[PDB]
Design an enzyme around this catalytic site. Structure first.
Site, PDB file in Angstrom:
ATOM      1  N   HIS A 127       0.922   0.010 -12.621  1.00 53.31           N
ATOM      2  CA  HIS A 127       1.112  -0.843 -13.794  1.00 53.31           C
ATOM      3  C   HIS A 127       2.076  -0.274 -14.837  1.00 53.31           C
ATOM      4  O   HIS A 127       2.493  -1.019 -15.740  1.00 53.31           O
ATOM      5  CB  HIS A 127      -0.222  -1.106 -14.496  1.00 53.31           C
ATOM      6  CG  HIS A 127      -1.231  -1.806 -13.646  1.00 53.31           C
ATOM      7  ND1 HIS A 127      -0.966  -2.996 -13.001  1.00 53.31           N
ATOM      8  CD2 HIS A 127      -2.519  -1.496 -13.354  1.00 53.31           C
ATOM      9  CE1 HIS A 127      -2.049  -3.389 -12.351  1.00 53.31           C
ATOM     10  NE2 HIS A 127      -3.004  -2.496 -12.546  1.00 53.31           N
ATOM     11  N   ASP A 164      -3.886  -2.478  -3.659  1.00 55.92           N
ATOM     12  CA  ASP A 164      -4.727  -2.570  -4.846  1.00 55.92           C
ATOM     13  C   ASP A 164      -5.019  -4.038  -5.142  1.00 55.92           C
ATOM     14  O   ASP A 164      -4.187  -4.904  -4.879  1.00 55.92           O
ATOM     15  CB  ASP A 164      -4.021  -1.938  -6.043  1.00 55.92           C
ATOM     16  CG  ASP A 164      -4.969  -1.570  -7.143  1.00 55.92           C
ATOM     17  OD1 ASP A 164      -5.279  -2.452  -7.988  1.00 55.92           O
ATOM     18  OD2 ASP A 164      -5.384  -0.393  -7.198  1.00 55.92           O
ATOM     19  N   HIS A 166      -5.008  -5.528  -7.826  1.00 59.53           N
ATOM     20  CA  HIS A 166      -4.202  -6.000  -8.941  1.00 59.53           C
ATOM     21  C   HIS A 166      -2.733  -5.978  -8.549  1.00 59.53           C
ATOM     22  O   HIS A 166      -2.288  -5.071  -7.843  1.00 59.53           O
ATOM     23  CB  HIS A 166      -4.423  -5.117 -10.178  1.00 59.53           C
ATOM     24  CG  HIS A 166      -5.836  -5.114 -10.693  1.00 59.53           C
ATOM     25  ND1 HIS A 166      -6.704  -4.067 -10.484  1.00 59.53           N
ATOM     26  CD2 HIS A 166      -6.518  -6.016 -11.438  1.00 59.53           C
ATOM     27  CE1 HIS A 166      -7.865  -4.327 -11.057  1.00 59.53           C
ATOM     28  NE2 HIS A 166      -7.777  -5.502 -11.649  1.00 59.53           N
ATOM     29  N   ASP A 248      -9.934  -1.359  -4.991  1.00 66.96           N
ATOM     30  CA  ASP A 248     -10.720  -2.168  -5.894  1.00 66.96           C
ATOM     31  C   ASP A 248     -10.754  -3.639  -5.489  1.00 66.96           C
ATOM     32  O   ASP A 248     -11.179  -4.478  -6.291  1.00 66.96           O
ATOM     33  CB  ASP A 248     -10.211  -2.001  -7.336  1.00 66.96           C
ATOM     34  CG  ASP A 248      -8.700  -2.114  -7.458  1.00 66.96           C
ATOM     35  OD1 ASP A 248      -8.020  -2.413  -6.447  1.00 66.96           O
ATOM     36  OD2 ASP A 248      -8.174  -1.925  -8.584  1.00 66.96           O
TER      37      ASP A 248
HETATM   38 ZN   LIG Z   1      -6.374  -1.956  -9.482  1.00 69.81          ZN
END
Ligand SMILES: [Zn+2]
Length: 305
Positions: A127, A164, A166, A248
């Site tokens: 990120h 991931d 995200h 996750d």
């Molecule tokens: Zn994540």
């Protein structure tokens, strides 16, 4: 032989009492990797000290000098919060530079040995953008490692695969302009950070975003891997695969809403083995400790035989 790159200094990035991006994530993984039947096939490596290899000539390819300066200064002044979710302890800048160095080591080692490498690093990276850290991330480990790899003899193309839960908005922003890199992401939508639409392919047709509805499990992910992910990676023919390995998307993970099981990452790694290039895994997210340990074990098990 499976290569693990780990320093106890990664435990010294301090995120607070009950922050989900905890030092224990690494211990939980390490203990599991040492307990598994094939533990004698794992070679452990301490990452190159930043006093010996300064990673900044590669960090600086991607991040603003102003951002780097302000981060270091927050750390060295006693710590703080970069945003509400992203603590920085006094060691955190040095620790993040060492996490970059572990990934750089992983590129080196994957190229040299043709064997898999797992960089067991904190903080995560995918990120972090050019100008700010966010979502527990300070520096863009995997995008930096890709840019490092492109400076190496024999590497003209790098593929990044982000599983991931995200979207790796930082990775995407940092590599999108680079015709030598492709980026593929599978991620929950809607979920943090609200980016990655399927129609965004970059100017170089080098971004493949695969958003998935909450509640996804093994079936939909395997379908995407066989139908979308591996054809995309294979047509590009990369000299290296860097996997942003976040765990996750599991049912038990507290921060997201997908329903994968630890053993599903074994299948993902088996798909990735269909590529002829070497593979570097770099830890991103994944926050339920037992699930995270079992998922790293599953990720590396297809390489044990
Ligand atoms: Zn994540």
């Amino acid at each position: 032989m499976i290569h693990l790159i780990y320093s106890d200094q990664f435990l010294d990035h301090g995120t607070g009492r009950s922050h989900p991006e905890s030092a224990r994530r690494l211990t939980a993984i390490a203990q599991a990797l040492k307990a598994v039947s094939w533990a004698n096939q794992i070679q452990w490596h301490e990452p190159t000290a930043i006093a010996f290899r300064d990673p900044l000539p590669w960090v600086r390819q991607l991040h603003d000098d102003y951002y780097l300066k302000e981060l270091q200064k927050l750390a060295e002044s006693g710590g703080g919060y970069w945003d509400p979710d992203t603590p920085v302890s006094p060691q955190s800048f040095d620790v993040a530079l060492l996490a970059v160095n572990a990934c750089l080591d992983g590129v080196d080692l994957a190229l040299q040995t043709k064997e898999p490498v797992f960089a067991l690093v904190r903080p995560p990276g995918h990120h972090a953008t050019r100008s700010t850290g966010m979502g527990f991330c300070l520096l863009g480990n995997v995008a930096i490692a890709a840019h490092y790899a492109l400076g190496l003899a024999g590497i003209k193309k790098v593929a990044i695969l982000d599983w991931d839960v995200h979207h790796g908005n930082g990775t995407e922003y940092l590599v999108e302009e680079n015709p030598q890199i492709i980026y593929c992401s599978l991620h929950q939508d809607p979920a943090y950070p609200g980016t990655g639409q399927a129609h965004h392919h970059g100017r170089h047709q080098n971004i493949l975003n695969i958003p998935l509805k909450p509640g996804a499990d093994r079936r939909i992910y395997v379908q995407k891997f066989q139908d979308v992910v591996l054809p995309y990676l294979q047509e590009f023919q990369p000299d290296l695969l860097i996997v942003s390995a976040g765990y996750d998307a599991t049912a038990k993970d507290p921060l997201a809403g997908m329903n994968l099981q630890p053993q599903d990452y074994k299948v993902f790694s088996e798909f990735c083995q269909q590529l002829p290039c070497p593979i570097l895994f770099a830890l991103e997210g994944g926050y339920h400790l037992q699930t995270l340990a079992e998922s790293v074990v599953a990720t590396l098990e297809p390489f044990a035989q």
